């Protein structure tokens, strides 16, 4: 037993991290087969970032302008293209450590592991969720651009995030691995603000089920609620609406614990209305919303990866 | 910016995990050079665990009784010895993925990453602290024995923990990699209880400095305190005593933020006495004590590993 914010084992991704240097800009790239993926603002300078035209900027580049370090081994670029906000550098060497992989654009509420990197070297790994407002509450310092977020599914790495930028509120914005930003953000230094965030209701419910699986039951009650009446209370506390689809996803957890989903909604309702009154759940004095129903099942049942 | 429970990148350890099977018992082992380390209760049975005599038990074993799977490759055992509560299986093949490594017995309050494993396959990675009562609040299901905890220091993996058992309170106990239990625990099914835990005071202070580095300042005050007067309040809230040595360790963080250590102690005092009053620190509504001063500096300055 026990319940922890658990990241996926990061080794499959560690073997793909490289350093990309162009001009005065150094950041991380992702080396898969013979392509290195990295944020396109690596071709910017200290005065380009205000409103750059990356198409002009890139047409003025030569392959030899791109320094890619894979450890103590320099890779030479033999081609380059831009795809949305990512730059793709074709190198003459295929990464022998390339894992089985996919690129996936995730929905808000979904979680993933972030391998924070500086200068192509991994620094740490942690679990994130894509917030409803398409930011992530990460831990990123200058130099971390190009670090990626991912999930692992049996033997397959599903890359879903590459880091680009930090918003004035201390939260983070980035793209999928095809270079499309999550949310309304753009890779230019202009006024941008996250948008009001909300709590991921289906995830909170998943985590309450995790608590029950693990022996916290103090927050349960004998009441039930309708989805409609629950959502009326959720909206008041700035929770995302719970859909019948969410209810269906919570089926397995509801079945394993014997607590009907709408019964758990009644518990969340009372927790929202009364607070926790000095009690904790799974070591938290807040309602935790960065575990998906799948995360809970994986960790409470012990799924692995080869 | 941002502050997350960050684990070390796990790849160096992933390449060392193997499955050890003896009789009806399967668990994880750690393959370094030509030795596989694993908990000695792999030689027990369903009726041995009540009060086994591992010396008799092991003298009755043959090398061929030990099935070690390294992926889809069976390793044959050519020797075995017991060292305290770990079993050491000499195999005929040195692990080519053996990282640079050390075995270290850590002090309570120190943190480490746990690579949770089942059947030799990594499941996830998370950050733990060794509690003052020598338990860890982990996430461990049946089959996770032999999973290891570690730190990484530049290129070197310092192994500090191997998992053995779960206590009735849902917390976990294990050994160093030389097989010595942390705390008073023994690997036999007899009444054992953790002992009263306490909060790791120097770590809470580190985390308050992390909050200041990251822009939370609401909990600061103009007061100061003496170490003596602070410790009088700490003892009342079941906090570990703060030593002058702890104060010295907090020097770098105090210097970077400009907040004297004892000034931060005055802040913690008021937080203990008044609570947080519905406010959060670094996304927590509890005082967090599983970040060391070193953890804070590493994450707020961006140290990597090759
Ligand atoms: C990233 O480019 C990097 O690591 N590069 C190494 C040279 C860097 C990561 C940032 C730095 C601090 N925390 C992070 O996550 N990203 C950027 O520098 C990014 C690049 C410039 C400006 N960038 C920012 O993140 C800036 N933020 C904004 O300007 N945000 C708004 C106002 C536009 C919304 C800051 C101020 C943090 C440098 C571009 C967006 C192209
Ligand atoms: C571990 O042996 C394993 O994974 N083996 C695979 C077959 C297992 C891990 C445990 C299981 C649940 N959570 C965990 O961390 N450890 C043990 O089974 C361990 C072995 C037996 C009994 N063990 C326990 O952990 C038991 N706990 C106790 O008996 N604890 C007290 C009362 C002695 C303090 C439980 C009840 C959890 C099986 C021995 C200690 C040798």
XYZ file of C-alpha atoms and ligand atoms in Angstrom:
694
model
C 0.000 0.000 0.000
C 0.808 3.707 0.012
C 0.129 6.306 -2.640
C 2.744 8.575 -4.208
C 3.072 10.943 -7.140
C 4.825 8.443 -9.318
C 6.603 9.248 -12.569
C 7.311 6.692 -15.260
C 10.834 5.257 -15.298
C 12.764 7.765 -17.403
C 15.588 5.654 -18.887
C 14.002 5.234 -22.323
C 13.829 9.030 -22.663
C 17.196 9.745 -21.029
C 18.849 7.932 -23.923
C 17.265 10.384 -26.360
C 18.336 13.708 -24.853
C 20.863 15.866 -26.672
C 22.090 19.439 -26.540
C 21.239 21.762 -29.440
C 23.284 24.944 -29.804
C 22.684 27.621 -32.414
C 24.370 30.992 -32.034
C 24.230 32.084 -28.392
C 21.275 29.793 -27.591
C 21.665 26.352 -26.034
C 18.739 24.082 -25.176
C 17.688 20.435 -25.175
C 16.678 18.372 -28.152
C 15.039 14.966 -28.514
C 16.953 12.485 -30.703
C 14.742 9.751 -32.225
C 16.086 7.791 -35.197
C 17.983 10.342 -37.307
C 15.965 13.441 -36.302
C 16.507 15.836 -33.395
C 13.392 17.722 -32.243
C 13.741 20.993 -30.382
C 11.918 24.299 -29.876
C 12.172 26.584 -32.883
C 13.141 29.618 -30.800
C 16.663 28.108 -30.720
C 17.161 30.115 -33.925
C 16.246 33.388 -32.150
C 18.624 35.846 -30.490
C 18.341 38.231 -27.532
C 16.607 40.813 -29.765
C 14.660 38.399 -32.001
C 12.268 37.234 -29.251
C 9.965 40.295 -29.302
C 8.165 39.430 -32.559
C 10.356 37.101 -34.640
C 9.467 35.811 -38.086
C 10.790 32.268 -37.796
C 10.358 31.618 -41.516
C 12.833 34.402 -42.442
C 14.979 33.436 -39.505
C 15.285 29.825 -40.572
C 15.820 30.451 -44.291
C 18.947 32.388 -43.203
C 20.354 29.375 -41.340
C 22.772 26.746 -42.627
C 22.982 23.170 -41.308
C 26.468 23.866 -39.940
C 24.972 26.611 -37.756
C 23.440 23.831 -35.600
C 25.666 22.236 -32.927
C 24.100 19.002 -31.621
C 25.974 17.289 -28.759
C 24.952 13.729 -27.882
C 27.161 13.390 -24.823
C 30.798 13.657 -25.876
C 29.816 13.032 -29.518
C 28.935 15.779 -31.990
C 26.196 14.977 -34.514
C 26.264 16.865 -37.789
C 22.981 18.200 -39.157
C 22.301 17.219 -42.777
C 18.894 18.882 -43.075
C 16.430 21.025 -41.173
C 12.741 21.819 -41.317
C 10.259 23.622 -39.138
C 6.947 22.024 -38.162
C 4.758 24.549 -36.322
C 6.861 25.609 -33.317
C 9.372 22.733 -33.349
C 12.478 22.558 -35.426
C 13.435 19.144 -36.890
C 17.155 18.574 -37.442
C 18.003 15.629 -39.688
C 21.347 14.169 -38.510
C 23.537 11.605 -40.237
C 23.301 9.123 -37.331
C 20.255 7.252 -36.083
C 19.989 7.138 -32.307
C 20.719 3.492 -31.376
C 18.885 4.049 -28.099
C 15.692 5.060 -29.920
C 12.841 3.403 -27.984
C 9.565 2.336 -29.470
C 7.634 5.579 -29.465
C 4.625 7.638 -30.562
C 3.813 11.353 -30.533
C 0.473 12.085 -28.852
C -1.408 15.300 -28.220
C -3.096 14.831 -24.840
C -6.332 16.327 -23.466
C -6.419 18.602 -20.434
C -6.699 16.594 -17.225
C -4.253 13.975 -18.537
C -1.003 13.441 -16.642
C 2.531 12.785 -17.783
C 6.089 12.509 -16.567
C 8.543 15.340 -17.290
C 12.257 14.619 -17.588
C 13.791 17.987 -16.749
C 17.046 18.508 -18.629
C 19.790 21.091 -18.939
C 22.458 21.023 -21.661
C 21.197 17.638 -22.830
C 21.687 16.087 -19.380
C 18.718 14.866 -17.301
C 18.221 16.631 -13.961
C 15.105 14.964 -12.521
C 11.753 13.419 -13.263
C 8.350 14.373 -11.939
C 4.642 13.925 -12.622
C 2.578 16.799 -14.166
C -0.974 17.259 -15.348
C -2.058 19.313 -18.316
C -4.236 21.893 -16.584
C -7.675 22.792 -17.952
C -6.155 26.131 -18.992
C -3.410 24.262 -20.942
C -0.554 25.252 -18.678
C 1.474 22.867 -16.586
C 2.718 23.573 -13.087
C 6.253 22.397 -13.733
C 9.703 22.991 -12.368
C 11.741 24.620 -15.138
C 14.708 26.979 -15.088
C 16.485 28.710 -17.925
C 18.018 26.018 -20.105
C 15.170 23.532 -19.671
C 13.502 24.268 -23.040
C 13.222 21.115 -25.103
C 12.730 18.888 -22.042
C 9.866 16.525 -22.833
C 6.859 15.082 -21.080
C 5.798 11.540 -21.780
C 3.861 8.462 -20.781
C 5.029 4.881 -21.172
C 2.611 2.164 -22.275
C 4.134 -1.303 -21.992
C 7.283 -0.795 -24.073
C 6.204 2.344 -25.935
C 7.091 5.936 -25.036
C 4.237 8.310 -25.917
C 5.777 11.775 -26.083
C 3.192 14.463 -25.382
C 4.974 17.677 -24.324
C 8.036 19.711 -25.081
C 8.848 22.695 -22.903
C 9.040 26.207 -24.396
C 8.297 28.993 -21.964
C 7.231 30.284 -18.582
C 4.232 32.519 -17.894
C 4.328 35.418 -15.406
C 2.351 33.362 -12.862
C 5.189 30.822 -12.610
C 3.453 28.171 -14.720
C 4.654 26.679 -17.958
C 3.558 26.364 -21.554
C 4.771 24.187 -24.369
C 3.841 22.163 -27.412
C 3.166 18.641 -28.465
C 6.042 17.008 -30.307
C 4.580 18.200 -33.596
C 5.105 21.762 -32.357
C 1.524 22.786 -31.694
C 1.168 24.753 -28.490
C -1.172 23.561 -25.846
C -3.567 26.432 -25.185
C -3.637 29.876 -26.791
C 0.068 30.522 -26.348
C 2.620 31.570 -28.947
C 6.436 31.499 -28.855
C 6.926 35.254 -28.926
C 7.479 37.684 -26.072
C 4.113 39.406 -26.043
C 1.481 39.783 -23.346
C -0.080 36.389 -22.707
C -1.940 35.137 -19.661
C -2.919 31.601 -18.770
C -6.641 31.901 -18.425
C -8.577 30.959 -15.311
C -7.751 27.455 -14.200
C -10.181 24.985 -12.667
C -9.864 21.783 -10.689
C -9.908 18.469 -12.572
C -13.018 16.939 -10.976
C -12.746 13.412 -12.377
C -9.162 13.240 -11.111
C -10.093 14.339 -7.588
C -12.640 11.529 -7.541
C -10.011 9.070 -8.766
C -7.771 10.149 -5.890
C -10.553 9.720 -3.336
C -10.914 6.162 -4.647
C -7.144 5.783 -4.229
C -7.619 6.895 -0.622
C -10.318 4.266 -0.027
C -8.215 1.543 -1.672
C -5.463 2.573 0.742
C -7.600 2.722 3.915
C -8.706 6.372 4.320
C -12.494 6.257 4.600
C -13.236 9.168 6.945
C -14.661 11.386 4.186
C -17.284 8.906 2.987
C -20.920 9.501 3.858
C -24.254 7.753 3.489
C -25.572 10.361 1.040
C -25.809 10.253 -2.714
C -26.279 12.958 -5.313
C -27.409 13.409 -8.859
C -24.836 14.361 -11.474
C -26.819 17.559 -12.074
C -26.871 18.511 -8.385
C -23.202 17.582 -8.052
C -22.224 19.747 -11.020
C -24.163 22.669 -9.546
C -21.916 22.459 -6.473
C -18.774 21.833 -8.541
C -19.253 24.931 -10.668
C -19.523 27.017 -7.467
C -16.124 25.735 -6.311
C -14.534 26.211 -9.771
C -14.425 22.497 -10.520
C -14.617 21.183 -14.062
C -18.008 19.680 -14.958
C -18.261 15.933 -14.416
C -19.623 14.203 -17.511
C -21.293 10.835 -17.835
C -18.126 9.835 -19.694
C -16.092 10.662 -16.577
C -18.528 8.549 -14.530
C -17.984 5.635 -16.915
C -14.181 5.984 -16.667
C -14.518 5.805 -12.859
C -16.398 2.515 -13.220
C -13.492 0.151 -12.512
C -12.491 2.078 -9.370
C -16.109 2.253 -8.225
C -16.425 -1.498 -8.789
C -13.250 -2.387 -6.896
C -14.129 -0.265 -3.852
C -17.892 -0.857 -3.889
C -18.603 2.889 -3.755
C -20.935 4.159 -6.472
C -19.444 7.057 -8.436
C -22.296 9.399 -7.480
C -21.849 8.300 -3.865
C -18.244 9.445 -4.125
C -19.544 12.665 -5.660
C -21.650 13.196 -2.530
C -18.452 12.827 -0.491
C -16.612 15.378 -2.618
C -19.607 17.725 -2.263
C -19.364 17.602 1.535
C -15.580 18.038 1.355
C -16.044 21.121 -0.830
C -18.751 22.500 1.450
C -17.139 21.725 4.818
C -13.458 21.517 4.079
C -11.327 18.811 5.614
C -11.438 20.248 9.158
C -7.786 19.593 9.940
C -7.761 16.086 8.471
C -5.621 14.797 5.634
C -6.261 12.464 2.716
C -3.339 10.413 1.417
C -0.978 12.796 3.191
C -2.557 15.897 1.621
C -4.562 18.706 3.235
C -5.844 19.695 -0.244
C -8.044 17.855 -2.721
C -5.496 16.441 -5.180
C -6.350 16.559 -8.893
C -3.183 15.378 -10.715
C -3.957 11.634 -10.639
C -6.093 10.234 -13.456
C -8.318 7.183 -12.957
C -5.693 5.279 -14.938
C -2.887 6.537 -12.691
C -4.759 5.274 -9.643
C -5.362 1.828 -11.140
C -1.756 1.526 -12.363
C -0.300 2.348 -8.971
C -2.832 0.458 -6.865
C -2.472 -2.690 -9.069
C 1.229 -2.617 -10.025
C 1.409 -2.396 -13.828
C 4.990 -2.493 -15.141
C 6.874 -1.877 -18.414
C 9.676 -3.909 -19.960
C 10.608 28.523 -11.550
C 8.216 26.070 -9.922
C 8.903 23.465 -7.277
C 8.100 19.763 -7.585
C 8.876 16.520 -5.796
C 11.560 15.510 -8.212
C 13.123 12.062 -8.421
C 16.506 11.383 -9.964
C 16.464 10.062 -13.531
C 16.110 6.308 -13.057
C 17.756 4.882 -16.202
C 21.051 3.951 -14.535
C 19.130 1.812 -12.027
C 16.586 0.446 -14.512
C 19.442 -1.310 -16.287
C 20.284 -3.175 -13.082
C 16.902 -4.670 -12.196
C 16.378 -8.413 -12.451
C 13.864 -10.968 -11.250
C 14.947 -13.474 -8.590
C 12.832 -16.600 -8.154
C 13.420 -19.268 -5.532
C 10.715 -21.832 -4.857
C 7.315 -20.124 -4.834
C 8.809 -16.677 -4.122
C 9.531 -14.116 -6.831
C 10.961 -10.662 -6.139
C 13.371 -8.090 -7.548
C 17.127 -8.200 -7.413
C 19.826 -5.633 -8.150
C 22.466 -6.756 -10.675
C 25.810 -4.918 -10.326
C 28.893 -6.460 -11.937
C 28.526 -10.221 -11.411
C 26.459 -10.088 -8.186
C 22.683 -9.924 -7.745
C 21.498 -8.409 -4.446
C 18.061 -9.237 -3.109
C 16.204 -9.632 0.194
C 17.107 -12.831 2.003
C 13.478 -13.761 2.674
C 13.391 -14.970 -0.962
C 14.546 -18.283 0.532
C 11.500 -18.422 2.858
C 8.169 -20.127 2.184
C 4.573 -19.443 3.242
C 5.221 -21.166 6.599
C 8.856 -20.088 7.087
C 8.048 -16.391 7.650
C 6.888 -16.711 11.288
C 10.361 -17.170 12.813
C 12.757 -18.470 10.145
C 16.389 -19.350 10.751
C 17.901 -18.051 7.525
C 21.250 -19.708 8.225
C 19.688 -23.214 8.206
C 17.444 -22.171 5.370
C 20.303 -21.064 3.162
C 22.651 -23.971 3.894
C 19.871 -26.182 2.447
C 19.845 -24.262 -0.845
C 21.749 -25.053 -4.033
C 22.780 -22.458 -6.637
C 20.420 -24.045 -9.171
C 17.521 -23.313 -6.804
C 17.892 -19.615 -7.759
C 16.200 -18.442 -10.984
C 17.500 -14.998 -12.015
C 15.824 -13.440 -15.081
C 17.503 -10.401 -16.639
C 14.782 -9.657 -19.168
C 14.494 -12.572 -21.581
C 17.910 -13.873 -20.459
C 18.423 -16.330 -17.608
C 21.539 -15.826 -15.473
C 22.929 -18.867 -13.707
C 24.044 -18.487 -10.095
C 27.574 -19.761 -9.425
C 27.708 -18.835 -5.740
C 25.629 -17.383 -2.937
C 26.228 -15.733 0.405
C 24.140 -13.920 2.957
C 25.185 -10.529 4.329
C 22.857 -9.480 7.164
C 19.386 -9.458 5.577
C 20.448 -9.408 1.910
C 21.341 -12.397 -0.154
C 24.219 -12.018 -2.661
C 24.015 -14.229 -5.749
C 27.247 -14.512 -7.727
C 26.334 -14.976 -11.422
C 28.597 -15.934 -14.305
C 27.884 -12.701 -16.228
C 28.811 -9.154 -15.282
C 26.048 -6.644 -15.923
C 27.284 -4.552 -18.889
C 24.916 -1.785 -17.815
C 26.546 -1.561 -14.376
C 26.770 2.176 -13.592
C 29.383 3.766 -11.420
C 27.977 3.164 -7.970
C 28.390 3.159 -4.185
C 26.399 1.661 -1.312
C 25.543 4.249 1.351
C 23.659 4.013 4.617
C 21.776 7.307 4.933
C 20.681 9.237 8.043
C 17.042 9.910 8.869
C 15.829 13.099 7.206
C 17.740 12.271 4.007
C 15.757 11.802 0.800
C 16.104 9.388 -2.077
C 14.413 8.188 -5.225
C 12.672 4.791 -5.241
C 12.363 2.819 -8.468
C 9.347 0.623 -7.773
C 9.643 -2.706 -9.569
C 7.656 -5.888 -10.042
C 9.095 -9.069 -11.572
C 12.303 -7.226 -12.421
C 10.439 -4.586 -14.447
C 10.327 -0.928 -13.336
C 6.857 0.445 -12.569
C 7.535 4.041 -11.485
C 9.877 6.384 -9.699
C 9.182 8.672 -6.779
C 10.928 10.673 -4.065
C 10.961 9.406 -0.419
C 12.518 10.525 2.830
C 13.872 8.257 5.519
C 11.592 9.203 8.401
C 13.004 9.908 11.867
C 11.451 6.595 12.942
C 13.334 4.803 10.101
C 10.277 3.972 8.045
C 9.546 5.331 4.610
C 6.124 6.348 3.365
C 6.396 4.512 0.071
C 4.107 3.000 -2.497
C 4.750 -0.751 -2.502
C 2.561 -3.725 -3.358
C 3.264 -7.418 -3.088
C 6.119 -8.198 -5.451
C 7.980 -4.931 -4.864
C 10.567 -6.393 -2.445
C 14.072 -5.792 -3.721
C 13.156 -2.450 -5.324
C 15.890 0.015 -4.399
C 16.168 3.616 -3.327
C 19.057 5.713 -4.520
C 20.597 9.105 -5.107
C 22.695 10.101 -8.097
C 25.761 12.307 -7.666
C 27.183 13.443 -10.998
C 27.668 10.061 -12.679
C 27.535 7.880 -9.562
C 24.509 5.980 -8.246
C 24.530 5.847 -4.433
C 22.228 2.986 -3.478
C 20.781 3.486 -0.005
C 17.624 1.361 0.362
C 16.219 -1.984 -0.597
C 12.588 -2.738 0.144
C 11.623 -5.639 2.435
C 8.316 -5.220 4.198
C 5.238 -3.233 5.106
C 4.175 -2.254 8.623
C 0.541 -2.353 9.799
C 0.304 1.453 9.545
C 0.868 1.303 5.773
C 4.490 2.461 5.929
C 7.540 0.590 4.766
C 10.769 -0.782 6.154
C 13.892 -2.036 4.480
C 17.655 -2.253 4.590
C 20.704 -0.609 3.185
C 22.332 -2.539 0.365
C 24.535 -4.317 2.886
C 21.360 -5.783 4.391
C 21.176 -3.829 7.626
C 17.656 -2.729 8.435
C 16.930 0.888 8.965
C 15.359 1.155 12.410
C 14.589 -1.624 14.886
C 12.912 -3.875 12.342
C 13.632 -7.512 11.554
C 12.616 -9.656 8.563
C 10.342 -12.000 10.482
C 6.583 -11.893 10.947
C 6.421 -10.823 14.570
C 4.811 -7.845 16.265
C 6.715 -4.722 15.271
C 5.592 -1.110 15.313
C 7.235 1.900 13.734
C 7.757 4.132 16.702
C 6.420 7.663 16.977
C 7.409 9.731 13.987
C 8.309 13.411 14.037
C 8.588 16.143 11.443
C 11.988 16.802 9.851
C 12.465 20.415 10.981
C 15.538 21.295 8.919
C 13.740 20.054 5.803
C 10.633 22.150 6.463
C 12.903 25.179 6.701
C 14.606 24.211 3.442
C 11.187 24.065 1.787
C 10.197 27.477 3.137
C 13.384 28.801 1.523
C 12.310 27.046 -1.686
C 9.012 28.919 -1.387
C 10.796 32.273 -1.034
C 13.111 31.500 -3.964
C 9.943 30.799 -5.947
C 7.972 33.899 -4.868
C 5.807 32.838 -1.885
C 6.639 35.290 0.894
C 3.324 35.590 2.750
C 4.509 33.562 5.757
C 7.562 35.701 6.511
C 7.485 38.043 9.484
C 9.656 40.711 11.057
C 10.348 38.600 14.155
C 13.353 36.517 15.042
C 13.883 33.765 17.580
C 16.632 32.033 19.449
C 17.415 28.426 18.589
C 16.513 27.510 22.176
C 13.137 29.271 22.037
C 12.477 27.819 18.588
C 13.232 24.282 19.762
C 10.889 24.749 22.721
C 8.072 25.409 20.239
C 9.214 22.646 17.871
C 9.154 19.975 20.557
C 5.543 20.959 21.374
C 4.528 20.355 17.749
C 6.494 17.066 17.528
C 9.219 18.539 15.343
C 12.758 17.204 15.420
C 15.204 19.454 17.294
C 17.051 21.940 15.101
C 20.793 21.787 15.732
C 23.450 24.375 15.035
C 24.645 21.925 12.379
C 21.241 22.181 10.680
C 21.538 25.985 10.847
C 24.938 25.779 9.149
C 23.559 23.513 6.391
C 20.828 26.119 5.759
C 23.521 28.765 5.278
C 23.613 28.758 1.467
C 19.812 29.046 1.223
C 19.767 31.769 3.871
C 22.481 33.623 1.953
C 20.728 33.387 -1.413
C 17.375 34.614 -0.075
C 18.724 37.115 2.461
C 16.607 35.606 5.254
C 18.551 34.643 8.374
C 17.973 31.023 9.392
C 16.603 32.021 12.806
C 14.358 34.542 11.054
C 12.953 31.657 9.035
C 12.579 29.761 12.304
C 10.411 32.612 13.599
C 8.234 32.172 10.502
C 7.895 28.435 11.076
C 7.020 29.149 14.727
C 4.115 31.378 13.686
C 3.018 28.816 11.083
C 3.007 26.109 13.760
C 1.149 28.342 16.207
C -1.399 29.857 13.807
C -1.662 27.361 11.007
C -1.804 28.494 7.414
C -5.338 29.940 7.643
C -6.499 28.624 4.282
C -3.321 29.597 2.435
C -0.941 27.311 0.592
C 2.832 27.165 0.266
C 4.277 25.761 -2.955
C 0.907 24.176 -3.685
C 0.701 22.487 -0.267
C -1.666 23.138 2.646
C 0.756 21.247 4.945
C 4.305 22.019 6.025
C 6.363 19.789 3.716
C 9.365 17.972 5.205
C 10.637 15.642 2.431
C 12.974 18.149 0.737
C 16.510 18.441 2.104
C 18.491 21.684 1.857
C 20.450 19.962 -0.907
C 17.262 19.006 -2.758
C 16.147 22.632 -2.715
C 19.473 23.923 -4.037
C 19.656 21.229 -6.736
C 16.194 21.994 -8.052
C 16.341 25.770 -7.688
C 19.786 25.909 -9.424
C 19.520 23.118 -12.024
C 22.262 20.585 -11.247
C 22.401 17.739 -13.784
C 24.064 14.316 -14.184
C 25.718 12.824 -17.251
C 13.911 28.233 -22.821
O 14.028 28.952 -24.074
C 15.285 27.776 -22.444
O 15.416 27.026 -21.501
N 16.261 28.239 -23.227
C 17.665 28.183 -22.866
C 18.463 29.349 -23.414
C 13.234 29.098 -21.751
C 12.744 28.366 -20.487
C 12.114 29.342 -19.479
C 13.145 30.185 -18.738
C 12.633 30.277 -17.299
N 11.663 29.203 -17.181
C 11.374 28.653 -18.354
O 10.604 27.719 -18.528
N 12.080 29.670 -22.434
C 12.134 30.934 -22.832
O 13.097 31.637 -22.590
C 10.958 31.508 -23.565
C 11.379 31.870 -24.992
C 11.429 33.394 -25.032
C 10.936 33.945 -23.699
N 10.633 32.758 -22.894
C 10.118 32.727 -21.672
O 9.843 31.666 -21.115
C 9.874 34.078 -21.049
N 8.472 34.193 -20.722
C 7.702 35.011 -21.436
O 8.225 35.891 -22.109
N 6.386 34.804 -21.372
C 5.330 35.618 -21.982
C 5.258 36.979 -21.314
C 5.539 35.789 -23.483
C 4.007 34.888 -21.806
C 10.761 34.389 -19.836
C 10.436 35.773 -19.291
C 10.500 33.410 -18.696
C 12.227 34.331 -20.248
C 10.363 32.654 -25.840
C 8.910 32.521 -25.378
C 10.590 32.451 -27.342
C 7.967 -8.625 -0.396
O 8.477 -9.840 0.208
C 7.590 -8.957 -1.806
O 7.273 -8.060 -2.556
N 7.667 -10.254 -2.113
C 7.060 -10.827 -3.299
C 6.591 -12.254 -3.091
C 6.814 -8.042 0.429
C 6.399 -6.595 0.101
C 5.216 -6.137 0.971
C 3.886 -6.743 0.538
C 2.861 -5.618 0.691
N 3.651 -4.402 0.760
C 4.949 -4.650 0.888
O 5.829 -3.803 0.948
N 7.301 -8.086 1.802
C 6.851 -9.038 2.610
O 6.004 -9.832 2.248
C 7.381 -9.101 4.011
C 8.155 -10.408 4.201
C 7.279 -11.279 5.097
C 6.060 -10.475 5.536
N 6.217 -9.173 4.882
C 5.431 -8.112 5.008
O 5.696 -7.043 4.460
C 4.223 -8.315 5.888
N 4.267 -7.356 6.966
C 4.534 -7.776 8.201
O 4.400 -8.963 8.472
N 4.947 -6.854 9.072
C 5.211 -7.041 10.502
C 3.919 -7.323 11.246
C 6.209 -8.167 10.753
C 5.846 -5.767 11.038
C 2.880 -8.265 5.146
C 1.734 -8.486 6.124
C 2.647 -6.895 4.518
C 2.851 -9.344 4.070
C 8.609 -10.747 5.631
C 8.709 -9.543 6.571
C 9.822 -11.683 5.642
